[PDB]
Symmetry: D2
Subunit: 344 residues, 4 copies
């Protein structure tokens, strides 16, 4: 056999350091121990290992936090489609129990939480044809369906609030911004199933720099005809979110998806020279040079994540991953959170 071929293929290797962990998956001969099955993800490899790390990182944020400021300010960011899905429930649970500090989402992420209190969203199919659905006034969101009557109901609900918002702006001197508006709609919806109802109630601010890119925008638009003058300033909200990072004792970032939401949170944390913890769950890829698809390491070069931080990115659909992450982290510390509130 060719010598060089043998040498190339049969190259010797010294052993790895003792610290090395072996790949090993959950053994179902033990039966189904869900906690152990989930912990086994850590040694399963690929994205399973990253999920395992995300659980450790989020648990570290929480532990730091349990040591109005807290020991660690957690920013929770998500894209609109996640509020359309059932992840809306998971997010509402975290906010209801004051487990995160700052929320930032896109317009869809705001409006659809309120609308779900008015009418439901349904399961559909990715394959459903647009023409046929439009003839029925049904809007398609992935494999989910939002009947357009939902937005008609949203309009009926919202208009009276916009009348009052412009009145208050003009007679009471109110300076409206996306966060102030979102807090208002949250108080107005007055429904325990609402993310913003709870955020408003727990004084957790919600940032959304492009609040006008959606249904709420359409309503603001039409309403501006009979009642012109409403102003939504994005500058004041910039100061608010940035100062939360700046004066935080320590920060963690839990970001689902990419775009403005992801970038906006990481830019705020650059103001303090980087977040101390960062966990991402998104399906974007880096090859196109997009910010949305950038590995957490690129954020390190910008100084948005501390050079000594251990950021984790899980490549996967959050609808699948987020509830499992919450089950193994926040949900496992309910007593600790309550204890901090004097309820345990």
């Amino acid at each position: 056999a060719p010598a060089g071929a043998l040498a190339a293929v049969l190259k010797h290797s010294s052993t790895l350091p003792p610290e090395s962990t072996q790949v090993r998956g959950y053994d179902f001969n033990r039966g189904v121990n869900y906690r152990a099955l989930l912990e086994a993800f850590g040694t399963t490899g690929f994205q399973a290992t990253n999920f395992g790390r995300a659980v450790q990182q989020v648990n570290a944020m929480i532990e730091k936090k349990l040591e109005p400021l807290t020991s660690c300010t957690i920013f929770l960011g998500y894209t609109s489609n996640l509020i359309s899905s059932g992840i809306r429930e998971t997010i509402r649970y975290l906010v209801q129990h004051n487990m995160v500090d700052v929320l930032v989402t896109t317009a869809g992420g705001v409006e659809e939480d309120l609308i779900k209190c008015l009418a439901p969203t349904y399961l559909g199919e990715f394959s459903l044809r647009g023409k046929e659905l439009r003839e029925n006034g049904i809007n398609r969101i992935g494999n989910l369906l939002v009947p357009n009557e939902n937005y008609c109901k949203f309009e009926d609900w919202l208009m009276p609030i916009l009348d009052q918002m412009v009145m208050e702006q003009n007679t009471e001197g109110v300076k409206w911004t996306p966060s102030k508006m979102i807090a208002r709609l949250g108080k107005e919806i007055n429904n325990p199933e609402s993310v913003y109802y709870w955020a408003q109630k727990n004084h957790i601010p919600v940032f959304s720099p492009a609040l006008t890119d959606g249904s709420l925008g359409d309503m603001i638009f039409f309403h501006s005809y009979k009642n012109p003058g409403l102003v939504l300033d994005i500058v004041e909200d910039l100061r608010l979110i940035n100062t939360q990072a700046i004066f935080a004792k320590c920060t963690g970032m839990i970001i689902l998806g990419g775009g403005v939401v992801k970038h906006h949170i990481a830019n705020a944390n650059l103001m303090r020279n980087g977040a101390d913890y960062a966990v991402y769950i998104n399906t974007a890829q880096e090859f196109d040079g997009s910010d949305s698809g950038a590995r957490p390491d690129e954020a390190v070069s910008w100084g948005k994540i501390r050079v000594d931080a251990q950021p984790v990115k899980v490549y996967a659909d959050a609808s699948l991953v987020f509830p499992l992450l919450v089950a193994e982290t926040f949900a496992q510390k309910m007593d600790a959170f309550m204890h901090e509130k004097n309820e345990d």
Copy 2:
């Protein structure tokens, strides 16, 4: 041989309709006829066929347009990373020659066009480690590099302009919005290599609902300490972009990337019950239910693309695709555009 196996595998088929086109790629035995090679993409299959269709669709927008209003209002949308790349040149060419009507981009998409007039962006690698780059103050964007000194220069350049913007707001009654600001910075940069210099000059509006999510935002933030009060209203800009769709004789949408940009343009066109032409070039996928990754058909269900329109989506990095699309469309009609301006 098993009968049912034979029947299943050897199932007969009638012939396809005469209208059917055969798959066939460019024959290099002809040598290199670039125009024919590009036209051959149409019958090559997969994304090549979609690129071929995108060329036909954009050419249709242009032809309709050549028949202050024009016969077809073209909205050009792009994400920030594309202005970081050399596609910034392609976009500036289209705007310089008044070939598109409305532009919408994200914050990075605005600021980096101006900054490139102050200092350049360089080629780097996706692999460059964040820690090492940060120790040098180098920001990484995909396989591109933006030295942080660039933003320091941006700050020196921008501050005087922000002083004047707040002065004008307070003594001259100016109501600032993202588009008005972008037009101002474009006039200020006064450089022929600037996209916004040309947009401002050709009265092509630029929308950017989250103009604060970036460097310009950081500068607005810091500046607000010595000179507080600047207001950036996103509501008035909503009326402006929506009315462009509403009063357009016909519309076309050329969108690179996804996120707010893509959604914002399609929402404006819903105001006229859908765009007449739509071409997309992005790398997002639909499985995660994201708006960014939605096939053009989902937009049809919302009524953002006319049910009778033939939208085209090319799955590919625009840095590769866009210059070829411009070469085969707009660049092929320079004389026609000039003719409309009485220069031919």
Copy 3:
């Protein structure tokens, strides 16, 4: 407000049919009921809903099966990297308990199961540089590491077996094929942690048309110098796998990943005019026209999946998804499987 704008945006919609299911995620206020949390994936939307469907489809295969033939022949296919990961354990569990009928994997999928009985694979990082690792003789597989000494040990282990295989071929008339070889190596490894040890023991055939594309191939190659003549025929294995589909009472397909494995299983089922059940878990996309990235519906056009079947594709990394699918399906029916074997 513009009339047509209002009409377009405020289009009415009738209600959806009563059969419609509402999107709703798990409510953590209930605490952590893992079974309910997993069942809630079904109404969470996006890939979570598809995972929910995959569980229902696999449970249907199993139920049909529990009604040497069985009521439903399940083909289990997987790519090499999944045997490198801890999913190797999940697969071995299914095979150990005779829960699937036919296995098909690539070369890596065969050899690495045997090698893990000789030396372990470790956790590494996607970021580890190739040059540095090669200087140490460490092979990188995603975020996993395979020290090259592992293959040296594999060679020491395999050579004696290859000597015997060629002897038997030449003096005992044995006609070697990939499946016969894999069964032999499985018997030889004689380790309860081995997938092929169990397959061989439970008479579950393993197909691998390109068994030579890997380490086993390198060893076959070098060995052919001192002991030439070994023949591995891929034709006989074709008859074997095809006849399993043809004479099956009913079939189900559980495929992880794409490529040859996925295509080979679906082609065998075309021989019976399509599989009755099909569940896929892979991360491939359809835009490039690849077979690996084709939606299950394309398989329907070929007649590889029955037109009346309800195939499910989950877009996600199987290292994350497969153990959860097994927990909710096969692992929940251990007693039923044992009952069929007279052990309950």
Copy 4:
């Protein structure tokens, strides 16, 4: 303004080294100079820059080659769907003019080249429903269509050849392997539009370890009933491809797509301790730990690409990219290739 905030954001940076290249895209004010537009991809960034590098790397392989052995043995690998597309023409052009040395493809990649000489493939849509198409006996491949009558014609064409192949095996002692078979079918098809007709004619071997995974396999299967005994050995083909790498003066790898094809070529080059040049064009991602989605650097850790080589991976659909790469490389050196053959 907060000091630490200013320090973090306004961090100074020294200038980059003089060797740094600036990002800059093609300026269409020059008109359309296709050669310059393509060369400009190099400084455009993202995948455009990688395409630019792929052109330089392939040109280096060719230059080395122009210095039966040649100075550089080029392995050309591609997946089946690319032969279904018009890229079949591009590949046939390279083979017709003896520009590559070894070809390796999957089963579909072999059979569909032959079938296209019998009947054409057509343009369809990704959206075409499987049920409807199957009722018509039309097979769907991405946005392409293959009428099933094509395979019926393939069967009529192939059977006589298989009768002879088994006759020759049994009376003339022929030992069949995938490469020997493919050479035979190539000679048999006797059509200048056939890739394998030209490969056979130019003595360019074609490897395909899973030649049975497709239509040719179905035909081999059915034929084995009346004429049993045909043997296709994959071991001898292993020696052939490996020795091409081993005894090559220098090697280059041009791989389109992933899977067996990609892995098989890189494994052969490991026999010589790595390929000297490597260019890849595929859409696979690394996150799932797949070999198909591995960055070229992982191949370096295995020693399949020389540690001192500059491999290039372009993330994009090859139907779009490959013809442009050939236009800028091989097609630009036709005279040089002919010169080496004494035709110039």
